[PDB]
Amino acid sequence: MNPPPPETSNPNKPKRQTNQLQYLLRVVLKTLWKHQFAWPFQQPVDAVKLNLPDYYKIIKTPMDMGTIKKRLENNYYWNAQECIQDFNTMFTNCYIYNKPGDDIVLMAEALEKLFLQKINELPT
Numbered sequence: 001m002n003p004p005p006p007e008t009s010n011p012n013k014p015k016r017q018t019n020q021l022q023y024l025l026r027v028v029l030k031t032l033w034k035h036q037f038a039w040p041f042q043q044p045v046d047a048v049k050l051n052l053p054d055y056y057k058i059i060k061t062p063m064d065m066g067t068i069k070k071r072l073e074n075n076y077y078w079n080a081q082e083c084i085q086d087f088n089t090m091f092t093n094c095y096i097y098n099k100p101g102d103d104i105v106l107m108a109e110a111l112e113k114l115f116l117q118k119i120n121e122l123p124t
């Protein structure tokens with residue numbers, strides 16, 4: 001039931017170390033990582049273990065903070081916007097599969113509120 005996880009290295013792809021990308025790893029991701037609600041989002045959804053055989057029938061572009069962390073550590077991104085997009089894909093997937101008011105949604109919303117606070121100002 002589990003698909004292969006998103007790639008965390010791609011050589012066909014050009015890489016960049018920007019000040020914003022370093023900050024997204026050192027400050028943004030690491031703060032979110034320690035949040036009390038971060039743990040469901042620290043690795044790909046394990047649909048077999050959660051016995052959610054429908055998850056990957058619905059979610060076709062999965063994303064999680066473990067994948068983002070590995071991408072950042074591998075300089076996988078060209079710019080901060082690409083990384084921010086991965087965060088937003090992660091949150092949106094949770095809002096798509098689940099319903100407003102669900103506990104997992106409350107957790108994603110708390111992480112998203114903090115994410116938006118931390119990315120409001122990025123380095124130059």
Ligand SMILES: Cc1ccc([C@H](C)Nc2ccc3c(c2)N(C2CC2)[C@@H](C)C(=O)N3C)cc1
Nearest residue numbers: 039040041045050055093094097098103104
């Ligand atoms: C409040 C509560 C209940 C269960 C769990 C289980 C143990 N782990 C887990 C990790 C990530 C996800 C989910 C479950 N959900 C399930 C709907 C619960 C899927 C759909 C989803 O979208 N994500 C992001 C954690 C937190």
